[PDB]
Amino acid sequence: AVRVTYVRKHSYNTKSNGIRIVKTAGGNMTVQHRQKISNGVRCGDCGCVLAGIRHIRPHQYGWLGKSKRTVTRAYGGVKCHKCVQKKILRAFLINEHNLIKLAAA
Amino acid sequence: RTKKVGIVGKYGTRYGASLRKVIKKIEIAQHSKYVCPFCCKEAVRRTACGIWECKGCGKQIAGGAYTLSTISGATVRSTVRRLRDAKNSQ
Amino acid sequence: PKQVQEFKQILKLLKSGSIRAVRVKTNGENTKFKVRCAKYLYTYICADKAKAEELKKAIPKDIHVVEIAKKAP
Amino acid sequence: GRRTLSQRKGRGSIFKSRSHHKLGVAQHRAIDFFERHSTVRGLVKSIEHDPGRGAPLARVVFRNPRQYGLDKELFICAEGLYSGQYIYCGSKASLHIGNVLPIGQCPEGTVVCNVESKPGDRGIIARASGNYATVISHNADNETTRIRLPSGAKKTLKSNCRAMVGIIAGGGRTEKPILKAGVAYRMYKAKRTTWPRVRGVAMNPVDHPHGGGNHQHVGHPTTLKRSSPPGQKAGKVAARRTGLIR
Amino acid sequence: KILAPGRVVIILSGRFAGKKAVVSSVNLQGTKDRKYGFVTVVGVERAPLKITRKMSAKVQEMRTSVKSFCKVINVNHVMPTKYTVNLEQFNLIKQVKINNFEAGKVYPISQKKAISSQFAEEYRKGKESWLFTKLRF
RNA sequence: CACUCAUUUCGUUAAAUGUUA
RNA sequence: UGUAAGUUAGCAAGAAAGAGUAGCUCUGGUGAUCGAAUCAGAACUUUAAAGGUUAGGGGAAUCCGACUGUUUAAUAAAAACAUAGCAUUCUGAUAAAUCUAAAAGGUUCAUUACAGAAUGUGAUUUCUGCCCAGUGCUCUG
RNA sequence: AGGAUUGAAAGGGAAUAAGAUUAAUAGUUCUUAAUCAAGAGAAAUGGUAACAUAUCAUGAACUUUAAAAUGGAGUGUGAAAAUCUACGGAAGAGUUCUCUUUUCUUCUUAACAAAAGUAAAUUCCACUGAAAUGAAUCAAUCAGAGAAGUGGAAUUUAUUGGCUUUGUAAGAAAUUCAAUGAAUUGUGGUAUUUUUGCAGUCUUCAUAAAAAUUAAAGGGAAUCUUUUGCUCGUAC
Secondary structure, eight states: OOOOOOSSSOOSOOTTOOOOEEEOGGGOEEEOOOOOOOOOOBOTTTOOBOSSSOOOOGGGGTTSOGGGGSOSSTTTTTSOHHHHHHHHHHHHHHHHHHHHHSSOO | OOSSOOSGGGGTTOSOHHHHHHHHHHHHHHTSOEEOTTTOOEEEEEEETTEEEETTTTEEEEOOSSSSSOHHHHHHHHHHHHHHHHHHOO | OEEOOSHHHHHHHHHSTTOOEEEEEEOSSOEEEEEEOSSOEEEEEEOOHHHHHHHHHTSOTTSOEEEEOSSOO | OOOOHHHHTTTOSSSSOOOSSOOOOOBOOOOOHHHHSSEEEEEEEEEEEOTTOSSEEEEEEEOOSSSSSOEEOBEEOBTTOBTTOEEEEETTOOSOTTOEEEGGGSOTTOEEESBOSSTTSOOOBSOSTTOOEEEEEEETTTTEEEEEOTTSOEEEEETTOEEEESOBSOTTGGGSOOOOHHHHHHHTTTSOSOOSOOOGGGSOTTTOTTOOSSSOOOOSOSEEOTTOOTTTOOSEESOSSOSSOO | OOSOTTEEEEEOSSTTTTOEEEEEEEESSOOSSOOSOEEEEEEEEEOOOOOOSSSOHHHHHHHTOOEEEEEEEEGGGEEEEEEEOOTTTTHHHHTOOGGGOOTTSOOOHHHHHHHHHHHHHHHHTTSOOSTTSOOOO
16 A cells, blocks of 8 residues: 655644545545534524534634525524524513513503 | 342442442432423433433433432422411411 | 536637637547636536537637647647 | 641642632622612523532523623522523522522521622532531521531521522532542542542651651550641641540 | 404514514415415514604604515414404505415515505504514514 | 721622612 | 352352364355355365464462552562541631741632541451550530 | 733644656645635515525624534444455566466546535424324434424535536546557445544543634614735755
8 A cells, every 4th residue: 555644744643633645646645634523503592503504614604605604584593493483482472471460450 | 130239240349248239229320310300201311410401301400419309408499498488478 | 627517608708808818628529628717717618529610719819729639738 | 857748738839729620610699789679580501510519500691780791600509400490689589499598588497508608708608519508596686697507516697698598409429439549539630639648657757747667656646736836737636535436 | 263364473483583474364274385274474574763853854764664574474483462453554465365475486576565665654653563663582 | 885997808890888868 | 061169149260171173075044136254064085183373271278468550760569558448636718737038928729518628447248345544635614 | 991921833723736846845846726814996585494595685882692612432334545356458567388368567636616416324394193102223212392104404424515427637647659659547346444424322429621713693873807925944
């Protein structure tokens, strides 16, 4: 087999020193540098991973399109649909209860 | 499989019969499931010492070190409930 | 490098003044029209000789054209 | 002679607390008008494990009484607290588990925890696992109340000293027998450097006052006065009694 | 009937989550294309802003404009309220039928602005108040 | 014995203390 | 294939003890809508087969330490140290211990008796007898 | 507005690859092809929904959320590479008086992007409402706070979007032949190992960093081309 060497001067297998050995022209293999695996967005209430948003590095969200870093809904990109649905029902039902309980019962 | 050394069989023969018997009672309770006080599902499992999380129900409950509710904290809950009634009613 | 897909978009590339150079590579099966623009190198894979000649005529006369064959320049 | 290990512990070089992963300081919120004369509501967002302490900690979020924003707190969780719970702090708070009330509002016999020794000092007593203090009696003549500390001693505090109603979570932690020296080694991961304790008799005369001779023995009485200088105060200090009590 | 024409509802999910809408037609059984219980709702996408005495009349009228939407929504995705409007006052809502909705294409902007204009006119007269206030989640 | 006014130990964004209304 | 006393019932245990193993020619079992090395069996032949390399000697008792771990770099690796278990002492935090010449100084302490600090013995089982005169320590005198 | 300096060439971090080249330097030079940062030239739609639209489709103060950013063990499994191997060959070499349609060697392709064809795992959404209880895993585990089934949405899989394929791009490179010019560069595998993710299980009196910096939300104040990219290390 073909053995390879690090290209940069980092000699230790740290988290930021990940490599991939891929085949090149002529049969020789070159060394790449692979990105770290990143987490996604979580709902602020239930801590569940949000859908519709990619799991990329924080600085790479700026390069994405405007619609690719959020969801077209209230609290989109910070609250899940279950998280939001309870917020709406909490807001309406509590105010309605206050209207009859107090406020000229 | 084993006559009487059920869960402390992982300790082999190296901690004394009584010490293995004392910890056997605690480890059975520590790793068991408990009935969720809010959704009544046998799904509460300890994560850290004093933190009990209810799996299929999404609740985090503070409790005992190795059981969901201690007997000392059970009477305190009933003591405070009785004291609150006396304060509320005269 | 980006690839244009059908015959319409390539013409608008030569019609536009953003062009910088054109290289035509003839392969054993098809011929590629590589338009060197400011940012990218657009290429069109033409498999029809009749439409290849039409694209050759549409090249503005004031731009450099490189014809490549089995031997590179 | 040399300096004993008890003396080297006071300089605090390798004996400093291993408090790097700790959540923070666990205490009540700073006392303001809205808690002296009214009540505030706090949401229990999560319950976490504070390294180095046996009881869980609660991340309570009070909204704000005077400005716009949030007030993120960090309480010592009472047994029975759950995520999403509403707790109330204030003079007019109801007598429920987890609420923080002035000690004078608690009826006699109430079980409280995280009691303040001085009003507004954010909790001193009854903070370890499963620990609590009991209200003994009140005294409206001088605005003072009596409570029973977890050690059994009685203490007289101002009636507006604050405490949380309930038991500190995590009780029964010390009833589980450590079996391995490794488990005891991990217990002090977020604590001080104390664990592997070499007996004084096993040392040399230079190292310890117990450093013996040809036979491992102390040689002199192990009960000492409180006025003994550091470096000789090894053993039992001001021991009223001694031996297996009956 | 809980879901009847003229009833005011609150949308729970979708792009218009938390908006207030008025029911036009009800179909609990569903159709061949619509395999669910649904209602046709006319809602207020953008609630009016508050106005003061300092703002000029052209700014006041602009600030009180109402942005409306017409949408078919599953009956499971709306929470009915106890409020009802008079469908005679909002006559244009009566003509928002199921057949007016074509799946895939944009709703006609002419009908949307015609309802939007009349929504703002009734808000200016102050006849309906709970409909035209933004719900704070 | 009573007080606070030096003094001690604290807490806060010195964020409604005390007396009237 | 078989495996004893003892035992904290988990082990002792690879206990101990015995038989088989090569080459060649075949058969069968284990799948998917052609393929995997694996297992079992049967003929015949020989210099009768793990052994080129690699690769546990075993049993019967006694003493010490319970066990995993650490140690005198350069004559001592242990029965010494640690250990978990047991027990004792002080301390309500402005405290206990304790560094500093001093200090809105420092450490355990981002701590609060299920805690902090000081000690002895050293797992489990069984048991810890009598003595407060002397020297300590203590007293609510 | 909230707290000063320094502290990592293994922690966090905007963005570059292939081929060629030198007596010696090369993610640094050359060729070709890219990327990043900082500059210059009354406010949209679609889907029931999960959510989706080459910038599109305004969004200030203030506040909140998420990311950067989190132990270990063990099991299963997706993909790539290496090794082994099946089919079909092209080119060269080795052995050959004893045979061997034989043994051996080459048959490759980057960053960055595209979107013919097509996956595995997980989480959600719509319809319906499960007991004669079903569904499933190596193990588990799950279900009227709603299973299974049918049809969908999203994300992860060493860059865009995981794999084949495509642009780059064969014009390079590899192996041959002739004396610079010519030839080739399929398709597979329910195999092993390494690497890289994923999914749930277990374990703790252990719960296993922060900041720079980035994005989103709530609120509603106001009304394609082109330029530049400094300092220092870089030999062995």
